[PDB]
Amino acid sequence: QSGPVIRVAGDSTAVGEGGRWMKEMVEAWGKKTGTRVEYIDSPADTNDRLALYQQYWAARSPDVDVYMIDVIWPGIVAPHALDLKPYLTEAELKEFFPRIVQNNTIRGKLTSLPFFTDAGILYYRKDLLEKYGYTSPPRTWNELEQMAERVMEGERRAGNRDFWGFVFQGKPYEGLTCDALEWIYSHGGGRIVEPDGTISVNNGRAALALNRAHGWVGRIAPQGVTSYAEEEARNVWQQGNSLFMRNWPYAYALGQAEGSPIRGKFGVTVLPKASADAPNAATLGGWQLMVSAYSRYPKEAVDLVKYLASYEVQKDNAVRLSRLPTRPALYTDRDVLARNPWFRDLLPVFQNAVSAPSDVAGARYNQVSEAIWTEVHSVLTGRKKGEQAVRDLEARIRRILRHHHH
Numbered sequence: 001q002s003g004p005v006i007r008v009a010g011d012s013t014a015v016g017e018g019g020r021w022m023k024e025m026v027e028a029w030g031k032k033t034g035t036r037v038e039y040i041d042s043p044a045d046t047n048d049r050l051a052l053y054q055q056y057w058a059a060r061s062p063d064v065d066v067y068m069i070d071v072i073w074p075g076i077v078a079p080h081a082l083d084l085k086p087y088l089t090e091a092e093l094k095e096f097f098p099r100i101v102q103n104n105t106i107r108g109k110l111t112s113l114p115f116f117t118d119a120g121i122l123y124y125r126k127d128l129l130e131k132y133g134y135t136s137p138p139r140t141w142n143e144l145e146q147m148a149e150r151v152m153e154g155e156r157r158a159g160n161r162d163f164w165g166f167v168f169q170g171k172p173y174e175g176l177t178c179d180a181l182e183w184i185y186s187h188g189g190g191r192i193v194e195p196d197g198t199i200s201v202n203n204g205r206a207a208l209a210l211n212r213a214h215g216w217v218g219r220i221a222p223q224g225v226t227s228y229a230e231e232e233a234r235n236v237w238q239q240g241n242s243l244f245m246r247n248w249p250y251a252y253a254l255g256q257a258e259g260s261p262i263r264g265k266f267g268v269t270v271l272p273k274a275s276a277d278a279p280n281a282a283t284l285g286g287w288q289l290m291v292s293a294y295s296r297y298p299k300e301a302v303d304l305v306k307y308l309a310s311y312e313v314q315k316d317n318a319v320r321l322s323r324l325p326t327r328p329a330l331y332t333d334r335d336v337l338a339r340n341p342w343f344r345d346l347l348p349v350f351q352n353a354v355s356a357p358s359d360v361a362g363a364r365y366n367q368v369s370e371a372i373w374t375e376v377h378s379v380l381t382g383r384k385k386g387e388q389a390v391r392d393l394e395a396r397i398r399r400i401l402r403h404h405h406h
Ligand SMILES: OC[C@H]1O[C@H](O[C@H]2O[C@H](CO)[C@@H](O)[C@H](O)[C@H]2O)[C@H](O)[C@@H](O)[C@@H]1O
Pocket: 011, 012, 015, 018, 044, 045, 046, 070, 071, 072, 117, 118, 174, 175, 176, 178, 230, 248, 249, 250, 284, 285, 286, 287, 323
């Protein structure tokens, strides 16, 4: 047909159904409104997407109108965002969780609408826990290790060469920062960089957390876990070859799909922690919808963003893709809850999720994060002990944030 073509970059066809579903939603809006649309695909890992989208932004490119942006990005991407505040009433904006709207608001600019939230959780094979005499998923990291060693011994003995105790995201990329924040915080080691700016990571609890994680590699987790992102972990788990997995909510719907080897065989719960008085750790993730400051079609782009962020599209995301709404009203919707009962069970885990240090690092967050995941990876690979790594990380972050004030 004719008129503007509204072009969207967001999510990836390389991560679950997200890219496919996103294209479907954008096509549905185009059909509803009689507007031409195009979907531009992205790489799997968030930090690779940031670099791709930065090419467009540095160019002031009009070739993408709407970007799906990570929770950790507002402080970096704000100059490239159209301020959405004038386009939403106060009532419309209050329909989203205020913490996420606050996150997305930089120096008063509403950079982006909340789309879906995210929190790290523990996936567990309930069939296998029952087989090996366990009644509850593990609450402590020591329990997780003990269960993993026992179930692995038994499943290996029964003939499954492919079977592991635990998979997670050990690749050097942003997902490892997420995993590592959960390890450190759940050992009482802090937030790596505190909201006040204190770089706190050089402490014995953070070091222990990293040594613990090294101890999994090649033992209860595959040697190759040091190259796993979300999907590599998910594919071991989904084939039936891991007792436990750390991952985000999206993996639940995919594991329940017809033809999944593990359909009906798993539950989810909060990640374990070092001891009963440590805090629960679930890293806060999630994605927002930004209209490009370079879009030639801001009114149409805003209309698309409000549609994607609407109740019925977020509902579809919850029901079909098990991704977490940013609208509190959806957590009381009968159909969302009947499909995903665990959304009610773990709502307090999602509410108490711990943010990575993107607010305090602001536009330097991707540099801080790269330091984190590289130093953590050096522990996972055995290159360094946790004590040295947290000392080296402290020094790196001090250099990166020197002269930065939030
Ligand atoms: O909901 C699943 C999403 O997984 C990825 O995003 C999560 O993990 C990132 C780290 O790898 C975090 O930075 C992000 O905040 C999390 O939401 C993936 O990039 C998304 O496309 C998936 O929808």
